[PDB]
Write a protein that binds this ligand. Structure first.
Ligand SMILES: [Cl-]
Ligand SMILES: [Mg+2]
Length: 276
DNA sequence: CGACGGATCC
DNA sequence: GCTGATGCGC
DNA sequence: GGATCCGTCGGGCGCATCAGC
């Protein structure tokens, strides 16, 4: 079945206006995405903070267009040292963060280009591109060990400010989160192991899934569709992209959006409105 | 990873 | 420099 | 025998490298 995201709720449950708009997008090759007009869409969305995953681009190769974003002038980029044509993440912000760091503990030695942490006045933002279990699950055990290291890292953050974790967490948590649950239980993104890891992430940190909090029983809401077999035209998809929030931020949560119509990748953007 | 062919279930 | 094939991973 | 369950298979994407010219 097709899906139509409901209108933007820009007011909190207690009536407070949203003050912060965050957009996250796995762009599947930043340079390709820009050629497919992805930045034109970003300009229309006008987020305060933009988080990008799978940039597949070292910072020296960023298109000049990215320098022509006055409203997102503070930009932080990370790419793996070994395999530059893969992974890569970015965080772009209207206001300058207080602190920016990279990775989950040892990036200076294992520069993976998957995680950026930025502290702002009232909250800490983490964006992540979680490692894929791979075709045939050949890297599933590495993904499980990474999941564990990531949980521990997030739990270990020194700041007492609430956390927003966003990005491509590369798992459909529950059956409602993809079109073909039965057929994919032995595929990357929907193994019991990855689902369990997501459940453990939520419990251990702890975090709430902003979209599912607001729309607990809404099916056919996806953020990824394989380029194969015209899957997007049939809305045969997976919800892989999340905004996860500290419990203390739920009163500030206005809406969590899925921007189904925005093209340029095999993922679509997601957008968060907070009243801070 | 969705499409497909084959087997199994009541 | 530029194209298109192959390799790799998503 | 329609629905379900399950394993196998071919192929869209982007980017790096390579061969050729
Ligand atoms: Cl940077
Ligand atoms: Mg991808």
């Amino acid at each position: 079945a097709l899906y139509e995201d409901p209108p933007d709720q820009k007011t909190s449950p207690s009536g407070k206006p949203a003050t912060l708009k965050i957009c996250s997008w796995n762009v599947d090759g930043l340079r390709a995405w820009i050629k497919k007009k992805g930045l034109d869409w970003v300009k229309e969305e006008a987020p305060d903070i933009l988080c990008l995953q799978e940039t597949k681009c070292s910072e020296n190769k960023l298109p000049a267009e990215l320098q022509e974003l006055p409203g997102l002038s503070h930009q932080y980029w990370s790419a793996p040292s070994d395999k530059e044509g893969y992974s890569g993440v970015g965080l772009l912000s209207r206001q300058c963060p207080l602190k920016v760091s990279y990775g989950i503990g040892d990036e200076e030695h294992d520069q993976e280009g998957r995680v950026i942490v930025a502290e702002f006045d009232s909250f800490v933002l983490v964006t992540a591109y979680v490692p894929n279990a791979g075709r045939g699950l050949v890297r599933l055990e590495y993904r499980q060990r990474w999941d564990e290291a990531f949980r521990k890292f997030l739990k270990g953050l020194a700041s007492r400010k609430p956390l927003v974790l966003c990005g491509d967490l590369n798992v459909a948590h529950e059956e409602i989160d993809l079109r073909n649950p039965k057929g994919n239980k032995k595929n990357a993104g929907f193994t019991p192991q990855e689902r369990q890891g997501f459940g453990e992430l939520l419990q251990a940190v702890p975090l709430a899934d902003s979209f599912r909090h607001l729309y607990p029983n809404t099916p056919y809401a996806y953020t990824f569709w394989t380029y194969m077999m015209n899957a997007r035209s049939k809305n045969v998809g997976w919800r892989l992209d999340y905004f996860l929030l500290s419990h203390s931020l739920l009163p500030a949560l206005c809406d969590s959006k899925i921007r189904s119509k925005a093209l340029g990748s095999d993922h679509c953007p997601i957008t968060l409105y907070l009243a801070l």
